[PDB]
Design a protein around this ligand. Structure first.
Ligand code: CLA
Ligand code: CLA
Ligand code: CLA
Ligand code: CLA
Ligand code: CLA
Ligand code: CLA
Ligand code: CLA
Ligand code: CLA
Ligand SMILES: CCCCCCCCCCCCCCCC(=O)OC[C@H](CO[C@@H]1O[C@H](CS(=O)(=O)O)[C@@H](O)[C@H](O)[C@H]1O)OC(=O)CCCCCCCCCCCCCCC
Ligand SMILES: CC1=C(/C=C/C(C)=C/C=C/C(C)=C/C=C/C=C(C)/C=C/C=C(C)/C=C/C2=C(C)CCCC2(C)C)C(C)(C)CCC1
Lengths: 91, 30, 40, 210, 161, 732, 107
């Protein structure tokens, strides 16, 4: 990737960042971002709790579909940050 | 027990590496 | 004695020596009267 | 070039003029208390003293740096702590009498120990309470970084919009109600922290019953 | 009890150390006769050693496996006297010293000859600053609030960045 | 066409400094005459190829020498008694007594006893005979040959890569993380599962039968069905003997934790699972950046739009991409800092969690490896800071970094330097004061008055990790804790026994001596960072010299004007911080070596009692353990440690010779050389032989460099014989 | 032969009284190594009153030297012509200082 092939994303003067920083998610509405963030956080917390807390994680038997979904907690964080960004962008 | 022939073929490979190192040094100098 | 000797005694090294001798005396006498105080 | 003794380290054209502008004073906030100015000679009326109380001058610490919060933020935090402490002291007082919700096989709300009352509940029951508090404190908080640097514009300190219409239209009566709020909140803060201190170390509050 | 330590009262190694020190002095004691200055001085030495060990036992210090006091500095008030109380004492004294120095510098600069006032101290006012620095925490707070503790940032030289 | 062809100025230089400066500026390709960026990058690429060839030649040489002259096959049978042999000695200066003394290790010729752990490493990864070592040496030789050919090839006209290709950051980072790290770690996991676990379990898997032999009885059917726990089922038993089928399991990927009981080293199944998992993580990480398809990330965009609100960090990270991708010195500094941190990490982790069989009982190898890697970590950290300073003085553009996160560092450099000075002064004052207080208290026969502070926070961390002797009862030390309950079924059953077992270096017990020495280490690190940070930040300029950037990185001075300007160039801040690097690593290695020597001797009370005062440090560590070294040769005879004694006194000599260059400066020697020039020119006969380069005294920076090199080399060559010879003589 | 010479005693303040080691003769102090004891034995001093009185005499001489230094700069300072009489100075230092010093010590 060359230095020229890069959009101007700097937003220090502005109060909020442009939607270009979201990449492919620039056009995603804020309501969809927020509701998906809530669903993702709930599902990931449920998966981690059922993997480690409710059942103590045994090496012989780990579900895998609970290991997946545990990654949605960072995804939920990103989704709610993007929800805020889209809310301030009015998009 | 490493054999004399084994040491000799290893020495031959080392000499090849020496020649290549000399060539690389010359090309770096120029 | 005079203003001149008072100024000389007020010079920096004389005052430092006197003050640090006073401080060392205070510390030494405190050690004499409350010896071996590892904690409050 | 502003109220602060130093220019903010935030740069020009990226916040400096926003931080270093004029900010409202402590005297323009409804917190004065006649009780402190309750002595012969100088004194106040209608429950308010002529001047506010600030021996440590935390209100005007912004002039040293913009790291320190503004009086808008301090009033927001004061009203938040007061409201939370009022609910907390009312809750402990009501719970210690033994009154509790009906309950069922799954949940048992019967516990007079306010310190360990949440521990008795199932994970879901207190989980809902904490989740509601987490969502609301976080949704209602918009423009709080603006109250820190001082821009009481978008957000008034303590005005979440919940029941703000019931405030009287007269300025005097509105300020009277706000002062009643602040006084009850501060009393409840002292009460709840005193009960907690009495629990942790006995004898901290001699008038305790809990 | 913390970190496996025990009090020095019930410390066999601490008691053994006390007896060893006492036995060492009493041995050295054999060279001198009764009633001499050296003999009475060594008797003072033995008494001070025993008093030190008794005081260390009574003070509640924790003695480790090596049989020496160990100081706990984490914040627990059970061992406040080890660090917290001496810490505040030193902080007060050091702030006193710094405040006396700062206030004398503030005075001496206003003088007609600050360079000579630094190497020849005006003792009559210097003692005044040393006395007045006793209330430094309130004075420092007042000067901070009044903007007279810190010099602004662009009034102090700074090198070319 | 003089020797410094790259430097016309040095070519025209008529004195003897031409040779010195040409040699020391040979590799400073950025400042060479008639140099372009593309040629610079291509020459760097070729030099990298040559360097890789040298590394592989060194490895192949070690392997060949152990195969040919080493007792690897004998050592395999009895690892804990046979001493590994590095290589044979050929020396026509040896006497008969020397030959007899150096004849050891169950061989008929003089030899050197290896202290690098290569025997343990090769035995663990599954080398069993000299033939395997010889074939590995041949493979490494062929690899070096290929790398040298590649280095030659990529300087050719049609094969010279371009500047855009060199500056393609996204593709490089994608591949060097998904292939160089990820796929290579996956390959190592495959090697373990295919060759190392079978060899530890008594199976001879080599190239002629690794295709036929299955790593697991089930094969890949569990892997494709998703029943991956079958590979963890049936782990190795606690009665297993390394290299034998008795007590051997069938698991290939496990998470037992702890240590293998016989070897006191980590399980090979655990290591294979580690490398497999981390390879998966690296391969996932390496798809982050955008390369030719559309998916990915743009590092320029990320850096540009990472700026916090209201200008907290100024303009944020704007321009950092440009400065980093343009300046090679910043990249070099970041790489050196990361590699120094990694070297410190491996030094700290090898002793705590040994991975190679029977290395825990090999005390000499452990100390040698720890000292080695700690010293290299210090060198790499100093280099990282030095190249950061070079970047500031050479490659920093304030126009690009207009109000940048990097420019604000220069903005508040005065505050940074003052606070580093404060913390250094505080730590030094109070650490030295407590040490001297303890010294005087013990000196006056009253140790009870010592100020002994228990490292309560470190002990708390040990308890949280699983230690129980302190009685804190927190987290994993508490049986009821949710953390213990969660981890109880995977790794804690092994980890708890490993940490609580007292025969191991995992989370050593600590005390007041540990408190004091750790605060001394903090002092030394903060002071080294102070010197290096001040050099880097004042490299551009200062109040005594605002135009330092015009003079550059390494210049002698600005003259005696303005009160004197000695050691102002910020190369002199490398020079001065190298002393503190040597100091801090010396303190760290002294601490490690003494605390481990006492524990190996089962005499930890000596460290716990005497480490609290400097007289105890000088008496019970240096003076006590220096006897077997200095007695390597004496009037009555000589032992195998005579070489180590000679070297101790040789490192002493080099260290002392460095003081000459560091103390005496150039004018004295220039006048002396003028007198010698007069004498040579005026004597008869000898005046017929006449120099070509006019002899001159060494330059100021040249002599600073030479004195520092003498200091450092004497340091290492006088500490290495001590740490090896004393440990060998005591065998504990 | 048996007694260790010692002429310094430390006060007991911070446990430094341990430095007052056993030097013999029922005396505790810091052992000296200046040879002054053997010097005085050669000189013939056998009691302490002699040491006390020569110490007082030395104090008187020190005061006299301070007075002379004050007098020869502030009251009656010589001239460069006086200073440059090197021949007379050598005569007085050979015959007068060294010669009479040796004669008096021999007596
Ligand atoms: C409080 C700190 C903070 C804040 C406010 C922001 C804010 C922002 N970041 Mg982020 N970022 C942060 C910390 C922060 N970052 C850190 C610490 C890192 C380093 C890891 C990054 C790395 C990063 C990158 C690489 C990028 C951003 C970008 C962004 C923007 C988009 C946010 C978004 O929803 O993307 C997140 C949206 C998601 C749907 C979630 C992504 C996937 C999750 C986190 C992980 C999933 C698992 C993983 C892939 C696999 C397992 C291994 C926004 C301006 C974008 C940009 O333009 O930057 C200027 C962008 O490309 N950030
Ligand atoms: C904290 C770290 C971090 C952050 C902040 C981001 C942030 C972002 N990444 Mg990600 N990324 C990360 C780590 C991170 N990444 C890592 C470790 C990797 C390596 C695996 C990647 C690999 C990666 C790629 C290859 C791409 C991104 C892209 C993005 C953007 C996604 C926008 C979005 O969700 O739109 C809303 C989402 C959609 C419209 C699609 C949703 C489809 C399903 C729901 C995806 C579910 C995936 C989930 C992990 C499960 C966003 C800026 C994309 C981009 O355009 O970047 C500029 C992109 O192409 N990232
Ligand atoms: C291909 C690589 C690989 C293989 C063959 C194994 C094999 C094994 N692992 Mg696993 N493991 C791996 C990678 C791998 N692991 C990685 C990358 C991690 C994260 C660091 C782990 C972490 C891990 C732990 C903590 C434990 C195991 C254990 C096990 C055993 C049973 C697992 C099981 O039944 O899962 C069956 C699951 C599936 C068939 C589906 C998995 C699909 C995943 C979730 C897809 C997404 C991956 C994700 C993006 C990668 C990043 C990691 C992220 C989760 C943070 C078995 C020996 C257990 C064991 O041996 O205990 C003694 C155990 O306790 N593994
Ligand atoms: C900077 C480090 C440092 C620190 C923290 C201390 C702290 C202490 N030293 Mg000191 N000490 C230091 C440096 C230090 N020392 C140095 C450099 C030396 C060498 C000269 C000494 C030599 C020394 C001696 C010989 C003694 C102390 C003692 C003491 C104690 C004095 C308490 C007292 O009597 O208060 C009394 C105050 C009031 C009653 C008010 C205290 C624990 C004394 C003690 O009792 O130790 C246990 C003591 O005997 N110290
Ligand atoms: C933590 C809660 C809290 C907070 C945020 C505030 C905030 C405020 N109070 Mg205060 N106030 C409180 C508790 C609090 N109060 C309590 C419990 C009482 C006693 C009943 C009062 C009584 C009081 C009066 C009578 C007045 C104020 C006023 C003010 C304002 C100016 C002073 C200032 O800068 O305070 C900043 C506060 C802090 C930085 C809190 C620091 C607390 C320290 C660390 C001590 C804690 C001790 C602990 C309990 C033991 C400001 C809005 C004045 C006002 O509103 O004028 C218009 C005014 O007149 N307050
Ligand atoms: C290194 C971090 C750290 C820090 C910053 C503090 C800070 C504090 N600790 Mg400490 N503490 C620490 C680690 C730390 N602790 C650890 C690891 C432990 C476990 C052994 C403790 C155990 C501990 C106890 C038991 C107590 C403190 C207390 C305190 C307070 C002392 C106040 C005072 O005396 O004035 C203070 C907030 C005291 C406290 O809470 O006072 C209110 C107190 O009683 N700490
Ligand atoms: C990845 C590792 C690495 C790389 C690629 C470089 C590369 C470079 N360094 Mg070095 N450097 C490193 C690590 C590295 N350094 C480390 C670890 C340190 C800390 C000790 C330093 C400290 C350092 C300094 C202080 C300076 C350099 C300089 C340089 C440049 C010119 C050096 C020269 O021509 O010397 C050629 C020298 C020789 C051929 C002989 C030197 C003789 C030594 C003493 C003994 C060699 C024994 C084998 C060159 C770009 C110089 C520079 O950039 O100046 C502007 C410079 O001044 N480096
Ligand atoms: C044992 C030798 C020694 C000592 C004690 C020091 C001490 C110091 N060096 Mg270092 N230094 C040394 C060798 C040493 N250096 C060598 C060989 C070099 C290589 C040339 C350097 C190069 C160097 C540089 C380049 C720098 C330092 C710095 C420092 C300070 C570090 C912080 C500290 O410990 O403050 C506490 C101080 C001490 C422990 C010693 C103070 C004096 C003791 C306690 C006695 C107290 C006074 C006493 C009562 C007076 C009695 C008089 C009769 C301090 C002044 C750095 C710094 O922070 O500078 C501000 C710094 O910039 N040093
Ligand atoms: C939904 C999940 C992800 C959708 C795919 C994203 C994408 O296609 O890239 C978006 C960009 C194009 O938009 C690009 O949008 C970009 C705008 S900007 O530069 O970022 O501001 C820019 O690259 C350009 O304008 C435009 O081409 O590139 C492509 O669309 C082609 C890449 C698709 C094929 C490569 C990988 C296939 C998908 C990967 C697997 C996804 C994991 C599940
Ligand atoms: C001058 C300069 C430079 C240089 C620099 C340097 C040299 C640096 C270094 C640095 C360093 C060297 C750093 C380091 C750091 C570190 C850190 C920051 C860490 C962290 C950590 C963490 C975070 C952890 C955590 C954890 C975990 C994860 C687990 C366990 C627990 C714990 C908590 C521990 C450069 C080149 C850039 C350029 C510019 C200038």
């Amino acid at each position: 990737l060359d230095r020229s092939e890069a959009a101007d994303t700097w937003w220090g003067d502005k109060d909020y960042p442009s939607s270009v920083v979201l990449g492919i998610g620039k056009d995603v509405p804020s309501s969809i971002y927020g509701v998906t963030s809530a669903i993702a956080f709930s599902v990931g917390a449920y998966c981690i709790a059922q993997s480690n807390i409710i059942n103590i994680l045994s090496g012989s038997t780990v579900n895998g579909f609970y290991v997946a979904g545990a990654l949605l907690v960072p995804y939920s964080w990103g989704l709610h940050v993007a929800a805020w960004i889209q809310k301030q962008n009015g998009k | 027990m490493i054999t004399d022939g084994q040491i000799f073929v290893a020495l031959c490979i080392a000499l090849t590496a020496a020649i290549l190192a000399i060539g690389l040094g010359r090309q770096l100098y120029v | 004695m005079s203003n001149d000797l008072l100024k000389y005694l007020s010079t920096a090294p004389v005052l430092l020596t006197a003050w640090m001798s006073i401080t060392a005396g205070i510390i030494i006498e405190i050690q004499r009267f409350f010896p071996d105080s590892l904690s409050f | 070039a502003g109220p602060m003794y130093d220019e903010p380290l935030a740069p020009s054209g990226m916040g400096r003029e926003f931080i270093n502008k004029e900010r409202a004073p402590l005297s323009s906030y409804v917190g004065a208390s006649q009780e402190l100015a309750a002595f012969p000679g100088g004194g106040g009326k209608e429950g308010m003293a002529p001047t506010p109380w600030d021996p440590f001058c935390f209100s005007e610490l912004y002039k040293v740096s913009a790291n320190n919060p503004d009086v808008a933020w301090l009033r927001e935090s004061e009203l938040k702590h007061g409201r939370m402490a009022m609910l907390a002291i009312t809750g402990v007082m009501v719970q210690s009498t033994g009154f509790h919700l009906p309950g069922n096989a799954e949940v048992s709300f019967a516990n007079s120990d306010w310190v360990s009352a949440p521990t008795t509940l199932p994970p879901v029951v207190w989980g809902q309470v904490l989740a509601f508090v987490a969502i609301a404190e976080g949704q209602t908080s918009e423009g709080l970084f603006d109250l820190w640097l001082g821009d009481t514009s978008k957000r008034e300190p303590g005005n979440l919009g919940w029941g703000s219409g019931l405030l009287s239209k007269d300025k005097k009566a509105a300020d009277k109600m706000r002062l009643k709020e602040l006084k009850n909140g501060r009393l409840a803060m002292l009460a709840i922290m005193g009960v907690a201190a009495n629990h942790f170390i006995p004898g901290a509050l001699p008038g305790c019953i809990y | 009890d913390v970190s496996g330590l025990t009090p020095c009262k019930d410390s066999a190694v601490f008691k053994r150390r006390l007896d060893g020190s006492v036995k060492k002095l009493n041995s050295r004691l054999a060279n001198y006769t009764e009633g001499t200055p050296a003999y009475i001085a060594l008797e003072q030495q033995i008494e001070q050693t025993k008093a030190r060990f008794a005081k260390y036992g009574e003070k509640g210090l924790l003695c480790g496996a090596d049989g020496l006091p160990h100081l706990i500095a984490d914040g627990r008030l059970d061992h406040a006297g080890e660090f917290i109380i001496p810490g505040f004492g030193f902080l007060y004294i050091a702030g006193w010293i710094g405040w006396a120095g700062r206030s004398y510098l503030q005075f001496s600069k206003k003088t007609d000859k600050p360079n000579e006032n630094e190497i020849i101290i005006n003792v009559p006012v210097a003692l005044g600053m040393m006395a007045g620095a006793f209330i430094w925490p309130l004075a420092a707070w007042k000067e901070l609030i009044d903007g007279k503790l810190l010099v602004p940032g662009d009034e102090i030289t700074v090198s070319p960045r | 066409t003089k020797f410094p062809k790259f430097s016309q100025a040095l070519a025209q230089d008529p004195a003897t400094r031409r040779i010195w400066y040409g040699i020391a500026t040979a590799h400073d390709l950025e400042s060479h005459d008639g140099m372009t960026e593309e040629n610079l990058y291509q020459k760097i690429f070729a030099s990298h190829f040559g360097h890789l060839a040298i590394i592989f030649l060194w490895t192949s040489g070690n392997l060949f020498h152990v195969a040919w002259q080493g007792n690897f096959q004998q050592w395999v049978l009895n690892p804990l008694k046979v001493k590994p042999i590095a290589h044979a000695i050929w020396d026509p200066h040896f006497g008969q007594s020397a030959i007899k003394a150096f004849t050891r290790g169950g061989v008929s010729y003089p030899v050197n006893i290896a202290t690098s752990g290569v025997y343990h490493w090769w035995y663990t990864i599954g080398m069993r005979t000299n033939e395997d070592l010889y074939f590995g040496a041949l493979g490494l030789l062929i690899l070096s040959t290929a790398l040298l050919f590649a280095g030659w090839l990529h300087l050719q006209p049609k094969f010279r890569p371009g500047i855009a290709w060199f500056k393609n950051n996204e593709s490089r980072l994608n591949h060097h993380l998904s292939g160089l790290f990820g796929v290579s770690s996956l390959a190592w996991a495959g090697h373990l599962i295919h060759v190392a676990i079978p060899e530890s379990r008594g199976q001879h898997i080599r190239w002629n039968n690794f295709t036929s032999t299955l790593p697991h009885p089930e094969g890949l059917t569990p892997f494709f069905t998703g029943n991956w726990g079958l590979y963890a089922e049936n782990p190795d038993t606690a009665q297993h003997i390394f290299g034998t089928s008795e007590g051997a399991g069938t698991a290939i990927l496990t998470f037992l934790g702890g240590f293998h009981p016989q070897t006191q080293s980590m399980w090979l199944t655990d290591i294979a699972h580690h490398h497999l998992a981390i390879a998966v993580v690296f391969i996932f990480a390496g798809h982050m950046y955008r390369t030719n398809w559309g998916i990915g990330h743009s590092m320029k965009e990320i850096l540009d739009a990472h700026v916090p609100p209201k200008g907290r960090l100024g303009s944020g990270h704007r321009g950092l991409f440009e400065t980093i991708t343009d300046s090679l010195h910043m990249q070099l500094g970041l790489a050196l800092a990361s590699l120094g941190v990694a070297t410190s990490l491996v030094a700290q982790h090898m002793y705590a969690l040994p991975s190679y069989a029977f290395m825990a009982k090999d005390y000499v190898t452990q100390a040698a490896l720890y000292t080695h890697h700690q010293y290299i970590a210090g060198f790499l950290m100093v280099g990282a800071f030095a190249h950061g300073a070079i970047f500031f003085v050479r490659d920093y553009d304030p126009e690009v970094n207009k109000d940048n996160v990097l420019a604000r560092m220069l903005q508040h450099k005065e505050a940074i330097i003052s606070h580093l000075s404060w913390v250094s002064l505080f730590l030094g004052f109070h650490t030295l004061g407590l040490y001297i207080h303890n010294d005087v208290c013990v000196a006056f026969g009253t140790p009870e008055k010592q100020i002994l502070f228990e490292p309560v926070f470190a002990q708390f961390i040990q308890a949280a990790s699983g230690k129980a002797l302190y009685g804190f009862d927190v987290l994993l030390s508490s049986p009821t804790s949710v953390a213990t309950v969660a981890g109880s079924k995977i790794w804690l059953p092994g980890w708890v026994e490993a940490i609580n077992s007292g025969k191991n270096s995992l989370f050593l017990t600590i005390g007041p001596g540990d408190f004091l020495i750790h605060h001394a280490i903090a002092l030394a690190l903060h002071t080294t960072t102070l010197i290096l940070v001040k050099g880097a930040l004042d490299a551009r300029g200062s109040k005594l010299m605002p135009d330092k950037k015009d003079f550059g990185y390494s210049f002698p001075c600005d003259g005696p004007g303005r009160g004197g300007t000695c050691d102002i160039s910020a190369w002199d801040a490398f020079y001065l911080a190298m002393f503190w690097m040597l100091n801090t690593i010396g303190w760290v290695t002294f601490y490690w070596h003494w605390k481990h020597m006492t524990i190996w001797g089962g005499n930890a009370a000596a460290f716990n009692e005497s480490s609290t005062y400097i007289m105890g440090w000088l008496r019970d560590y240096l003076w006590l353990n220096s006897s077997p070294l200095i007695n390597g040769y004496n009037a009555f005879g000589m032992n195998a440690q005579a070489v180590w004694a000679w070297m101790f006194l040789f490192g002493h000599l080099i260290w002392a010779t460095g003081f000459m260059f560091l103390i005496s400066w150039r004018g004295y020697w220039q006048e002396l050389i003028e007198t010698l020039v007069w004498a040579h020119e005026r004597t008869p006969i000898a005046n017929l032989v006449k120099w070509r380069d006019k002899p001159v005294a060494l330059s100021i920076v040249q002599a600073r460099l030479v004195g520092l090199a003498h200091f450092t080399i004497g340091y290492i060559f006088t500490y290495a014989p001590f740490v090896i010879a004393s440990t060998t003589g005591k065998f504990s | 032969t048996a007694i260790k010479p010692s002429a310094q005693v430390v006060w007991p303040i911070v446990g430094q009284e341990i430095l007052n080691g056993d030097v013999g003769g029922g005396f505790s102090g810091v052992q000296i190594t200046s040879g002054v004891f053997q010097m005085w034995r050669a000189s013939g001093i056998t009691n302490e009153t002699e040491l006390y009185w020569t110490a007082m005499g030395g104090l008187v001489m020190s005061a006299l030297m301070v007075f002379a230094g004050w007098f020869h700069y502030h009251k009656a300072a010589p001239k460069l012509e006086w200073f440059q009489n090197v021949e007379s100075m050598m005569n007085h230092h050979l015959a007068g200082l060294l010669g009479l010093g040796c004669l008096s010590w021999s007596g």
